[PDB]
C-alpha cells in the first residue's frame, strides 16, 4: 500500500488485542478474525492524523476506510492555515467520499449477486441443493465476502496545535488534561446510539418509532446508529422490521465533527479507543465506569512504561485480565463477561511525562 510507505508519528502509541470468547470448560479461548484498526500519521508542516476503527462483518471496510481517509486527508487536502470552518469542510468531504466510493466499489458485485440468486431456487437448504447448484453457491459466498462489512470510526486531526475530532459511531476520543487537582477527563465525541437523544430525534424525523428502537437499543447486532459501509443497512433497511418504516437511510455515514480544541500550554494526552475496549470494562465493572477508569489506568502506566505503545498495550492487557478474571471467578458480573470484542487503544501524548 501507499499507506505503508510514509511518516509515523513518534508522539503516539497503540495497544490492541483481538476479540475472545471464553471456553465453556474454561481453559482456552476462541477468536474470529480481528476487525479493529487504526492509524497514526504525521504529514508535512505538522498536521497529524489519528484514527481508531471498529469493523464488523469482516474487516474489509475498516481497511478500505483507513486507506481512503488517508488518501483524502494526507495528500495536501490539509494544511494549518485553513481554520476550523475549512478543516471541518475537508473532514466532512473526506468522509463523504469514503462512503460513496465504498458503495460504488461493491455495485458490480451486488448486481452479479442478484443475477446469481435469480438462478437459484429460493428458500432451499444449505445442503440438499443439487450439486449442480454448488458452483453458484460458492460464487455467491465469494461475493458475499467481497461486499460485506461496516465500520465505525473516530478520527482526530491535529492542525497546528488545534485538535479536531470526527466521529461516526461508538468509538471514543478522550482528552485527558493534567491540572493541579488531578487529571480531567472529557469525552470529545458522543456515542451514536439509541441512547443518544439527538440520534433518537433524527431517527423519528425519518418516520421510525423512537419508542421501540430506543427500547431494543441495538440494530442488527450493532448499537451504533451511524456507520460507514454495510450494504445491508444502507440498501436493505426497508426490509428490517426495526427500520422498515424509515423514509430515508436510518443509519448514516456522516461524521459529527467536534469543536476545535486549542492545545497550547495543555499537558496530558488524547485517547482514541474502540467500542470493544470500554464495553469490556463496563461489562466487568458496571455501567458508565470506563472513561474514568481507562484514563486512570493510562495515567498509572505512563509512570512505568518506556514507550507509548507499552503504555497503551499495558492498559489493554489490564482490561482483558479484569474481564477474564471476572468471568473466571463467578461473582454475579461473570454472566456479563462470557466473551469480549476487539480492543484498540491509541494514545497521543501532549507533554505528559513518561516513566
UniProtKB/Swiss-Prot annotation:
One Gene Ontology cellular component: protein-containing complex
Residue spans crossing the bilayer: none
GO biological process: aorta development; cardiac septum development; coronary vasculature development; heart morphogenesis; in utero embryonic development; lung development; non-canonical NF-kappaB signal transduction; positive regulation of cGAS/STING signaling pathway
Superkingdom of the source species: Eukaryota
Cellular location(s): Cytoplasm, Cytosol; Endoplasmic reticulum membrane
Outcome, altering residue 198 to A: Loss of interaction with XIAP
Keywords: Cytoplasm, Endoplasmic reticulum, Glycoprotein, Membrane, Phosphoprotein, Ubl conjugation
Post-translational modification (record): These phosphorylations inhibit TAK1 activation by a feedback control mechanism.
Main location: cytoplasm
Outcome after substituting residue 201 to A: Loss of interaction with XIAP
Tissues expressing the protein: Ubiquitous.
Domain called PPM-type phosphatase: residue spans: 13-350
Topology of the protein relative to the lipid bilayer: Peripheral membrane protein
A GO MF term: molecular adaptor activity
Coiled coil: none
Role summary: Key adapter protein that plays an essential role in JNK and NF-kappa-B activation and proinflammatory cytokines production in response to stimulation with TLRs and cytokines. Mechanistically, associates with the catalytic domain of MAP3K7/TAK1 to trigger MAP3K7/TAK1 autophosphorylation leading to its full activation. Similarly, associates with MAPK14 and triggers its autophosphorylation and subsequent activation. In turn, MAPK14 phosphorylates TAB1 and inhibits MAP3K7/TAK1 activation in a feedback control mechanism.
Subunit structure: Interacts with XIAP and BIRC7. Interacts with TRAF6 and MAP3K7; during IL-1 signaling. Identified in the TRIKA2 complex composed of MAP3K7, TAB1 and TAB2. Interacts with TRAF6 and MAPK14; these interactions allow MAPK14 autophosphorylation. Interacts with STING1; interaction takes place following cGAMP activation and promotes TAB1 recruitment to the endoplasmic reticulum, triggering MAP3K7/TAK1 activation and STING1 phosphorylation.
Protein name: TGF-beta-activated kinase 1 and MAP3K7-binding protein 1
Residues of the full protein shown: 16 to 370 of 504
Amino acid at each position: 500500500s501507499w499507506t505503508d510507505d510514509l511518516p509515523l508519528c513518534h508522539l503516539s502509541g497503540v495497544g490492541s488485542a483481538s476479540n475472545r470468547s471464553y471456553s465453556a470448560d474454561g481453559k482456552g479461548t476462541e477468536s474470529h478474525p480481528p476487525e479493529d484498526s487504526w492509524l497514526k500519521f504525521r504529514s508535512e508542516n505538522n498536521c497529524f492524523l489519528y484514527g481508531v476503527f471498529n469493523g464488523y462483518d469482516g474487516n474489509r471496510v475498516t481497511n478500505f476506510v483507513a486507506q481512503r481517509l488517508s488518501a483524502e486527508l494526507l495528500l495536501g487536502q490539509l494544511n494549518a492555515e485553513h481554520a476550523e470552518a475549512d478543516v471541518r469542510r475537508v473532514l466532512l468531504q473526506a468522509f463523504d467520499v469514503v462512503e460513496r466510493s465504498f458503495l460504488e466499489s461493491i455495485d458490480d458485485a451486488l448486481a452479479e449477486k442478484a443475477s446469481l440468486q435469480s438462478q437459484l431456487p429460493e428458500g432451499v437448504p444449505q445442503h440438499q441443493l443439487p450439486p449442480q447448484y454448488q458452483k453458484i453457491l460458492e460464487r455467491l459466498k465469494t461475493l458475499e465476502r467481497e461486499i460485506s462489512g461496516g465500520a465505525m470510526a473516530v478520527v482526530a486531526v491535529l492542525l497546528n496545535n488545534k485538535l479536531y475530532v470526527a466521529n461516526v459511531g461508538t468509538n471514543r476520543a478522550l482528552l485527558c488534561k493534567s491540572t493541579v487537582d488531578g487529571l480531567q477527563v472529557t469525552q470529545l465525541n458522543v456515542d451514536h446510539t439509541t441512547e443518544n437523544e439527538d440520534e433518537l430525534f433524527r431517527l423519528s424525523q425519518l418516520g421510525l418509532d423512537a419508542g421501540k428502537i430506543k427500547q431494543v437499543g441495538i440494530i442488527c447486532g450493532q448499537e451504533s446508529t451511524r456507520r460507514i459501509g454495510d450494504y445491508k443497512v444502507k440498501y436493505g433497511y426497508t426490509d428490517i422490521d426495526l427500520l422498515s418504516a424509515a423514509k430515508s437511510k436510518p443509519i448514516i455515514a456522516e461524521p459529527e465533527i467536534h469543536g476545535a480544541q486549542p492545545l497550547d500550554g495543555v499537558t496530558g494526552f488524547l485517547v482514541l479507543m474502540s467500542e470493544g475496549l470500554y464495553k469490556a470494562l463496563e461489562a466487568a465493572h458496571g455501567p458508565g465506569q470506563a472513561n474514568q477508569e481507562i484514563a486512570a489506568m493510562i495515567d498509572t502506566e505512563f509512570a512505568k512504561q518506556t514507550s507509548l505503545d507499552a503504555v497503551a498495550q499495558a492498559v489493554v492487557d489490564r482490561v482483558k485480565r479484569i474481564h477474564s478474571d471476572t468471568f473466571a471467578s463467578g461473582g454475579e458480573r461473570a454472566r456479563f463477561c462470557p466473551r469480549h470484542e476487539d480492543m484498540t487503544l491509541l494514545v497521543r501524548n501532549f507533554g505528559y511525562p513518561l516513566g
